[PDB]
Amino acid sequence: VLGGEKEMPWNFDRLVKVEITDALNKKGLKYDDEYDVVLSIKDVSGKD
Amino acid sequence: TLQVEQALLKHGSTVALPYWDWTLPISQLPSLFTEQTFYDAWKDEVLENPFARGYIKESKGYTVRDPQPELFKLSADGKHSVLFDEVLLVLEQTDYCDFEVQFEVTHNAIHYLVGGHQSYSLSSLHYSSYDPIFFTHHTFVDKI
């Protein structure tokens, strides 16, 4: 996401999609199995 | 009936108890009694109208009103209740004792018309003084 200090507030309406099928099948886990999604956000400055 | 006005004034009255003229056609009970609860927000608390029920300090119950079909009957012209004719009859005669004997049952009537078939209502005089419509009606009686 491209953000700066002088950004007028903005918020989306509907979720954005990312494909996961090609990794879930490659691990063998069906979508209903117990699995987690972990995301780590790093700014350009370098702070998590 | 007069006795209650001194208590009301000393406790913060504004006008005396109004009289209800039931000789006029009666669509239903007056909306002042018919209303249940109103909100004013001055105390930020809804207030229930004390002109529907009455608490009893010995029985822990409350009175219950009941309309009766005959109360809604109307005269030939439609501008008077059926009780109008007998009210005129009471008015017309001369002697005071005859007036009283002809007059008692007249105001006794509404007690039974609105008291229904409940032991705790205006039907029995034992507890009829626990409903303010009784005060209003006897005020109209004094007016007669």
Binding site: - | H11, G12, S13, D40, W42
Partner: protein, 48 residues
């Protein structure tokens, strides 16, 4: 320049108002000048 009759009338009328607690009560009427604020109108988020 008052006399007994009307002086009694005024004092009794005011003492009648004082212990009232109605919509046209002494407290309610005198509340217009000051706290609680009800003006310009309670709908506005600023009250004074």
């Amino acid at each position: 320049s008052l006399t007994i009759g009307e002086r009694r009338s005024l004092v009794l009328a005011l003492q009648s108002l004082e212990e009232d607690s109605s919509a046209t009560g002494f407290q309610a009427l005198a509340s217009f000048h000051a706290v609680p604020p009800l003006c310009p109108y309670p709908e506005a988020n600023q009250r004074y």
